Amino acid sequence: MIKAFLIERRSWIAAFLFQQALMLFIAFVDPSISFGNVLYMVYLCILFFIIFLWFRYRKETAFYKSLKTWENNLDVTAINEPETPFEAMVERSIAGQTEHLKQTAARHRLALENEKDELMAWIHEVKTPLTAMHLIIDRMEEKALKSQLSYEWLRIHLLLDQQLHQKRISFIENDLSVEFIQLQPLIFKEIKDLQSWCIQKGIGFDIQLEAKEVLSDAKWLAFIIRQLLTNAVKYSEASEIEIKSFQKGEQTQLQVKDCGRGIDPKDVPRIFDKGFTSTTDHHDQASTGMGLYLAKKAAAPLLIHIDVESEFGAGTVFTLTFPIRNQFEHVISV
Amino acid sequence: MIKAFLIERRSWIAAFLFQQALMLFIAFVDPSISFGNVLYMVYLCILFFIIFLWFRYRKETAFYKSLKTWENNLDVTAINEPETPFEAMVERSIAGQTEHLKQTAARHRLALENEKDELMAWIHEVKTPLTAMHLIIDRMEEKALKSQLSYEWLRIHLLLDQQLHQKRISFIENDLSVEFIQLQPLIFKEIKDLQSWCIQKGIGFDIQLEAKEVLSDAKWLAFIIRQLLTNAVKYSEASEIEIKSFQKGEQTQLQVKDCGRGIDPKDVPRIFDKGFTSTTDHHDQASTGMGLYLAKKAAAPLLIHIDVESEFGAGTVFTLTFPIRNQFEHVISV
Amino acid sequence: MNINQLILRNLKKNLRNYYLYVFALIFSVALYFAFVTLQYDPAINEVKASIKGAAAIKTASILLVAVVAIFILYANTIFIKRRSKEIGLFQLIGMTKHKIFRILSAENVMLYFGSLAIGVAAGFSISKLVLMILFKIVDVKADAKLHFSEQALVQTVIVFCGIYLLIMIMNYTFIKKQSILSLKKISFFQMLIGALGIVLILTGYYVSSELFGGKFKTINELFVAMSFILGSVIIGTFLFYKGSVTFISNIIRKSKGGYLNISEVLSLSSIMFRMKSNALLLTIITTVSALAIGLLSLAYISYYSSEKTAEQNVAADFSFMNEKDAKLFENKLRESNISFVKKATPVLQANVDIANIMDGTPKEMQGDPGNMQLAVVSDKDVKGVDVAAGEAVFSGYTDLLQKIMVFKDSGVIKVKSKHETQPLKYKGLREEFLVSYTFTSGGMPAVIVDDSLFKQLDKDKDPRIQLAQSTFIGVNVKHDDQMEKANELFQQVNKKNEHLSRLDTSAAQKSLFGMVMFIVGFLGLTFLITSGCILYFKQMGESEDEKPSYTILRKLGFTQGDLIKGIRIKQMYNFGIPLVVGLFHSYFAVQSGWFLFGSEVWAPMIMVMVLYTALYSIFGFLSVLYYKKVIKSSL
Amino acid sequence: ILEANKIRKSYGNKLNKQEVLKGIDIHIEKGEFVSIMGASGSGKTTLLNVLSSIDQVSHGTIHINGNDMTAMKEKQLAEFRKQHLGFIFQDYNLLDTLTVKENILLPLSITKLSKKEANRKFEEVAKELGIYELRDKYPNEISGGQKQRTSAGRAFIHDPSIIFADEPTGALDSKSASDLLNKLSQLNQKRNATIIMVTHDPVAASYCGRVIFIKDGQMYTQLNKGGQDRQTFFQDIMKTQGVL
Amino acid sequence: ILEANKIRKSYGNKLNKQEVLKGIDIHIEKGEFVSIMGASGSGKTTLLNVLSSIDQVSHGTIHINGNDMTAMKEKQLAEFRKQHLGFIFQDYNLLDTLTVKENILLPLSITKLSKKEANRKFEEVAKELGIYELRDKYPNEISGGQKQRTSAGRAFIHDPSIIFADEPTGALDSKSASDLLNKLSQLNQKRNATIIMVTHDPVAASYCGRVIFIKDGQMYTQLNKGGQDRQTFFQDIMKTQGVL
Ligand SMILES: CCCCCCCC/C=C\CCCCCCCC(=O)O[C@H](COC(=O)CCCCCCCCCCCCCCC)COP(=O)(O)OCCN
Ligand SMILES: CCCCCCCC/C=C\CCCCCCCC(=O)O[C@H](COC(=O)CCCCCCCCCCCCCCC)COP(=O)(O)OCCN
Numbered sequence A, B: 001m002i003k004a005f006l007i008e009r010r011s012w013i014a015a016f017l018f019q020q021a022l023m024l025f026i027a028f029v030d031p032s033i034s035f036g037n038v039l040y041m042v043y044l045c046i047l048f049f050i051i052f053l054w055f056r057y058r059k060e061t062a063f064y065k066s067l068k069t070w071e072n073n074l075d076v077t078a079i080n081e082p083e084t085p086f087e088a089m090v091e092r093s094i095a096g097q098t099e100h101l102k103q104t105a106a107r108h109r110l111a112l113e114n115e116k117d118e119l120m121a122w123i124h125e126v127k128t129p130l131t132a133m134h135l136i137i138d139r140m141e142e143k144a145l146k147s148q149l150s151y152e153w154l155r156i157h158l159l160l161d162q163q164l165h166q167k168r169i170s171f172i173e174n175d176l177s178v179e180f181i182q183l184q185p186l187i188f189k190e191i192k193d194l195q196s197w198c199i200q201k202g203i204g205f206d207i208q209l210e211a212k213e214v215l216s217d218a219k220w221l222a223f224i225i226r227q228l229l230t231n232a233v234k235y236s237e238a239s240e241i242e243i244k245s246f247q248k249g250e251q252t253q254l255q256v257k258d259c260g261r262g263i264d265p266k267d268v269p270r271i272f273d274k275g276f277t278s279t280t281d282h283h284d285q286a287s288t289g290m291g292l293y294l295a296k297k298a299a300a301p302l303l304i305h306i307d308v309e310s311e312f313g314a315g316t317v318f319t320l321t322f323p324i325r326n327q328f329e330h331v332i333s334v
Numbered sequence C: 001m002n003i004n005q006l007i008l009r010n011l012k013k014n015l016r017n018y019y020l021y022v023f024a025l026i027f028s029v030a031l032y033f034a035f036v037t038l039q040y041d042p043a044i045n046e047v048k049a050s051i052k053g054a055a056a057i058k059t060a061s062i063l064l065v066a067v068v069a070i071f072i073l074y075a076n077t078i079f080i081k082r083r084s085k086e087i088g089l090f091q092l093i094g095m096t097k098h099k100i101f102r103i104l105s106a107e108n109v110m111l112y113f114g115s116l117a118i119g120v121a122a123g124f125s126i127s128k129l130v131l132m133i134l135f136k137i138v139d140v141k142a143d144a145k146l147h148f149s150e151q152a153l154v155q156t157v158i159v160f161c162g163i164y165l166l167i168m169i170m171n172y173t174f175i176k177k178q179s180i181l182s183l184k185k186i187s188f189f190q191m192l193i194g195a196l197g198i199v200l201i202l203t204g205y206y207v208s209s210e211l212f213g214g215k216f217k218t219i220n221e222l223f224v225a226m227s228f229i230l231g232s233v234i235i236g237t238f239l240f241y242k243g244s245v246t247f248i249s250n251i252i253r254k255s256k257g258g259y260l261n262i263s264e265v266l267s268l269s270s271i272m273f274r275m276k277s278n279a280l281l282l283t284i285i286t287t288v289s290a291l292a293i294g295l296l297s298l299a300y301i302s303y304y305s306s307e308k309t310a311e312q313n314v315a316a317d318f319s320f321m322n323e324k325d326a327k328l329f330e331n332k333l334r335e336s337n338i339s340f341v342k343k344a345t346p347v348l349q350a351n352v353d354i355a356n357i358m359d360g361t362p363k364e365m366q367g368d369p370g371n372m373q374l375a376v377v378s379d380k381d382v383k384g385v386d387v388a389a390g391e392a393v394f395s396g397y398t399d400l401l402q403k404i405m406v407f408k409d410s411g412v413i414k415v416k417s418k419h420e421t422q423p424l425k426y427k428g429l430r431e432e433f434l435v436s437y438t439f440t441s442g443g444m445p446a447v448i449v450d451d452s453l454f455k456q457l458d459k460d461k462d463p464r465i466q467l468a469q470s471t472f473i474g475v476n477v478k479h480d481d482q483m484e485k486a487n488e489l490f491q492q493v494n495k496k497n498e499h500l501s502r503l504d505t506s507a508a509q510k511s512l513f514g515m516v517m518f519i520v521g522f523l524g525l526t527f528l529i530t531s532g533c534i535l536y537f538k539q540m541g542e543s544e545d546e547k548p549s550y551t552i553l554r555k556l557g558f559t560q561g562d563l564i565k566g567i568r569i570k571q572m573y574n575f576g577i578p579l580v581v582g583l584f585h586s587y588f589a590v591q592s593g594w595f596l597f598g599s600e601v602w603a604p605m606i607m608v609m610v611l612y613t614a615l616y617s618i619f620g621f622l623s624v625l626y627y628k629k630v631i632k633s634s635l
Numbered sequence D, E: 001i002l003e004a005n006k007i008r009k010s011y012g013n014k015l016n017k018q019e020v021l022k023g024i025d026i027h028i029e030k031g032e033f034v035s036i037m038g039a040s041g042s043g044k045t046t047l048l049n050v051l052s053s054i055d056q057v058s059h060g061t062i063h064i065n066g067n068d069m070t071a072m073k074e075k076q077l078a079e080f081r082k083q084h085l086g087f088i089f090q091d092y093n094l095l096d097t098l099t100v101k102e103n104i105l106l107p108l109s110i111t112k113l114s115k116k117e118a119n120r121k122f123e124e125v126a127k128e129l130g131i132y133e134l135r136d137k138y139p140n141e142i143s144g145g146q147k148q149r150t151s152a153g154r155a156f157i158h159d160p161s162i163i164f165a166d167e168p169t170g171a172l173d174s175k176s177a178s179d180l181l182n183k184l185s186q187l188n189q190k191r192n193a194t195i196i197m198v199t200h201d202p203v204a205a206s207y208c209g210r211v212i213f214i215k216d217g218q219m220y221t222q223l224n225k226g227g228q229d230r231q232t233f234f235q236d237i238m239k240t241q242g243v244l
């Protein structure tokens, strides 16, 4: 601390000493000069200079001391307000660099948001020919051809709806809303939506709903139903899907169970991860596996919990644990 | 910067001059020391101090001038090499700031690359069901609804394939390749793709290709050809297309002549602008409008000249000038 | 292109590299102006001494200008040699030989004349300081005042204009001469020259040991020995650098085995090949440094004698020859309120034989040993010793004699009287003087005989060698009090300057040797600066020839902090040898004649060597600052 | 010993960026003699520079003998590259004011091995490369081939881990090159030390164990040799290069 | 262009007289890259003196474009070499006080010619050699290879016809020497100019197309190259030099 100040100002102490030595020499080599008085003045000046040096060090070495700690300090305002131009120079340079960095980061984020915006827009103008194809597909007569075309329409429609909902799941935080929802009619229309797939694959269903009222977002609850039902249907064949709704404790649970081929015991807990797809059959390579992870991610803002009970060769049981009504008392208050 | 230096060290000079003044005062006031033998000491000390200050100014005021010279424009290493201990900490802080900015930029670029990879995977899983829907749709037996579903298949194809041209033009500059190309198979493939739609619109193809070989790249010129053909058709209704290619001197020219509505003279220069859409016909809303600007930005490295002869109520004549074959010898040989 | 702007860039580049040259030029101009201003000051005549006075500065100036001119000429013939890679290029581009001369005689004239103009400006404010320094060694009071002394400017301008004319002549003689677009193991002789040089130096020192001993004692036999000593020393010093350094370096190299570290490989590489080329300059440097140091030491040793010999030459504070003058001066002192303790003693001159008491050789004759004239005094007059018959006690120390006249213990001492001779024995030697040197010839001591024997010796009164005055008329002083008024009374009594006073013989010697030391010291400082600059101006070339070596070593992992460490030792080995050889030369030359000036050594020599070593090692420190710059840009 | 994990490097002058690494990550274990080659404008030389401490790595992670050396200061990095990573350069890089024995012993003056141990180690090194007859002869008296052997002997005296050779056999005739390569192979056989070498000569690369054909910053397969004939591997690498 | 016949260099200092050159007949035409090579003590410097007209010629009949130098005076010789001949030296000679650009523009800044053509010429030379980006740097802050390239380019701006060259590898390592030789070979093709060197480096002599061997003068046994693979030619050159 003191050592740096001394080793920097070593060029002025030498000048002071040289001045004192020259004055003493000239006073000594003269016949009309009192040597003792000059010596006394030299001693007094040395003492006063030492005191002045102490004060100068103490006052001076603060700005660089603060900016030295600033380099890895968590805060950024640790730099003291400058009082000397030689420090205001560094302050100006650092402030300019910081503001340039901030502006660059903001510009990059803004550009990314815009490009996502054009992507979703183009998704919409691709969606319009999709409903054109839906109309033309609704307009045939042959049972087999209509069934196949409707199945392909439904598959591609659900894929691109999943992708569009993946685009908006980045800012789903902006459209949260909680209201009462009836389950049975919504399930009926959702089952009607998946008619082509179950017609082609001959998959049955069972409906057992003891509970009728839940609390979530209508569109998001419908999308959760879509995710679970499409996953079960694509992972089951010619099986009766047993759905059960009951209040376990203070939480409403929606237990849906299929009777498909099941999942290998080694891979049971890995369903919720990104990209998890079946590898037993070569037909499942093209599958995405993205819906489960995004459903898990955006399940938290709706306070909906998912539980899985899967067995190989028997089926998979999925539980949708709705949160307590009294747990929404805190949410509404906040 | 003399003023800044004199203001900065406004204490040591004052101390030295105060000592000289005190010596002069004690010599003057006391009738015991000759007054003619102290002015010489003051003179010598003042001379030495002036010389020392002049020699110290240059060695001190360098770093804080180089810092302002660099500022924030460019040449981050233009700052002088720190010598004194004080400037080392400032240099360390500046280096840390620069390193943090570099890390932020690298993270941003990585995130952009990841999102590009995700959207490209979405493109792949759109392009495989494209093949699926192709093989399923090319199995039905009707005629009018067949033409319907056929031209929407090509409509989706257009926008979705244009998206591949967009993602490719994001890095187009690294895919140059020059060799002879036969245009007749390309034209026949385009007609076969647009067979149903051209038949529905009743557009005959007058193909007489006098020229046989051209020297350019295949993919983006093919894109330009389909884009120009679609534009010329959508500025037309129930008109015959005259496809004429002649070896005009040393360059090949495709003169495509139609009998469409044409372009109004007051808006001819604005057709090539980004985002331009024709407001005369409501059927042109389905056209994206990004194809023409993408073709222009891709053809600038290709040295392609497009000549337009559009007459309102008579038709539109588009003439594209292939670069001379000898012009690409500088690209092949060098 | 842009001839003027190119010349300006070249001038700035030259000014950045050569700054010690400007410093030396200004320092030389300052001293020359100071001495020439001091010579013509009317107050210089207050320096009373045996020497003329202001006729010695006329020697100092003429002997200083030669050194200045030699240094400037050698520096300007070193500077131009390092600019051939540009002369050849300018000769091949198409510029003739009458434009290159104007190119390289406009980047030098401004520098030289600016330094000259600055030197005259800064020589005005040091003349008073030099005068005040001078009027403190000679111990005189004056009223030194500041003045310009317009006579000095003409001399300075003429001298330096002539030197510059010679420089231009020499430069023009080289450019259009050497041009025409032109861009190891030891031997048998080299294994003998080093041994020959070492043995020559050693035998020269051994011969220098004796000189004024028991041998060679003849008025003309010393000169041949001294000339042989000087010749052998110079020849051995020359042969030392051209062959003996190689031998020692070879032994040290083929004694380490094969494990040489970085410091040794950086050190031995330079001074085994580069010191051999420079063998005509280090000799001059060493000899001149030794001469200056020795002369300065003696001039300070003789200052201690300027006090002891003045106290001792006159036994009392005054000495008187004439009875009437002494009595009238005493009458004047009577009303001066001065209590003088006067004592007088008759003095007799008798000859004796002391050939049997000298333990040396008959060559130490200094006259007939059987007929040395000595001073004999009575026993009653002496108040400190009471001798008896047949016994004699010598008086005085006379440091010369102990190294010249070696005296034995009690033997037999015969007195050469007219018709008798008594045997006496040597009891002891005293130290104080009871007789002024006038009565006892040059430096011969005085003997004491018994009062009883004095009653026969004075009655005999051999009338052959007796002095004109047989008395020691001399007035003493009371306790330490004011003496100046008695001094001018003494001078106004004696206008014939034939009496000797204690406080007047202590001034002429002091003034003379003060002037000698003043001149020698300033000349030595000038030569120190000159030699430092000259030795610094070759390390630039030696380092720019070693730059590739650094680059290669740096690709093997070595860091700059180790190359600088090795350079810090290479520079010490480069700058140490001449200084050590000069110090040995000075110490082995001074000791031969320390007992001819004063009676105290080891006092001045240590101070002189310490000051010289510091002022010479400043330049040694001022070279690693260029070595570091060379290393840094050798990536 | 040397594991590489996606090392990045872009050559830029602050205005134009030219990337030269395109997905390189090499897995190298102890005691194997490899060779890196391919094209003329390829980044194989840049790859060898960035792998060592000569050039800084843009993005990625490297591991030398278990140590992670990417994000560490210059002083300890210099200490690492001094006490590991011996080197053989394209040129001799020898001093003329020294002898051969002093030249191949100067870099050992940092640890102070006394004298007997240094002499024994120097004798052991020299009697294997056949330079013990030239202990006290200046470098300007020996043939050009012997200087390369002297440089190799200097490089193989402090026992480093990875030996970044860079085209040693570039300015020799057939016989001296064959002898030098045979000596290097024998010394690799005796003393366990990984040698990474770059070359353009097929006969030079024939003595190696594995060959990596970097082409425009890509893997593009790799040979394995094995218990095969030397000539058969020679024609194998000839036809592999002919395929390129 | 050059037809050197009957190469005679006289001697006879004090009493000893040596026939270092004993009469050699030399044939080159337009656009060759010939380099004569010998051994130490064969007077390569004297080869420069007799060929490059550095000193006064003694005898012989050699003509540049049919202009014999033995029927023409000293000042006329200086003018002829300054306006018709160029040189490249062993150690680069660049003024430190000037800039990279100023050093190359110096030779043309003495004839009082228009500025725009000089700027265009410097643009072309810098772009074709690769030192364009360094237009405002000093010779104290650039490496040896860049300095040597600038020195080589200095002689390609005064509208030259023939550029001599002594060994351009004394103060360069292998990488810089290879880059300089490749650049010079490319310059030979773009603009037609004959380059003659006499070097002691077989690597630097492998780049040539016609190599001439001497031992004391007239000895020939020159090679032809023609369609060699550029490496077997190097081996043959080294073998022939060793044998002879
Ligand atoms: C008896 C009376 C004694 C009076 C003695 C007075 C002599 C002192 C006076 C004036 C010195 C004139 C000669 C030296 C000045 C030339 C040095 C100089 O100015 O160089 C400039 C920068 O300064 C330097 O780099 C050199 C620094 C040297 C400081 C002055 C040193 C001169 C005296 C020290 C000699 C000490 C020897 C003592 C031995 C007894 C140009 O360099 P740059 O790299 O281009 O940087 C430019 C900054 N933007
Ligand atoms: C080659 C060796 C170089 C060494 C330095 C040489 C500098 C040249 C200058 C002056 C020569 C002085 C010789 C040595 C001094 C002798 C010491 C001596 O005599 O003792 C006493 C000291 O008095 C003196 O001699 C004066 C000493 C002043 C010399 C100062 C030493 C440095 C000289 C450099 C001055 C020039 C620089 C000008 C710009 C700063 C004399 O008696 P006192 O105690 O003063 O009492 C008087 C009545 N009470």
Ligand SMILES: CCCCCCCC/C=C\CCCCCCCC(=O)O
Pocket: A011, B048, B051, B052, B055
């Ligand atoms: C031989 C006489 C010595 C005294 C000379 C007096 C004149 C001094 C003049 C000014 C000195 C200025 C040089 C100081 C340079 C900066 C100091 C430093 O960097 O260490």
Ligand SMILES: CCCCCCCCCCCCCCCC(=O)O
Pocket: C618, C625
């Ligand atoms: C009192 C006499 C001795 C004085 C010793 C100090 C004199 C100054 C020493 C340094 C001068 C040069 C400083 C900068 C040199 C450089 O950067 O090249």
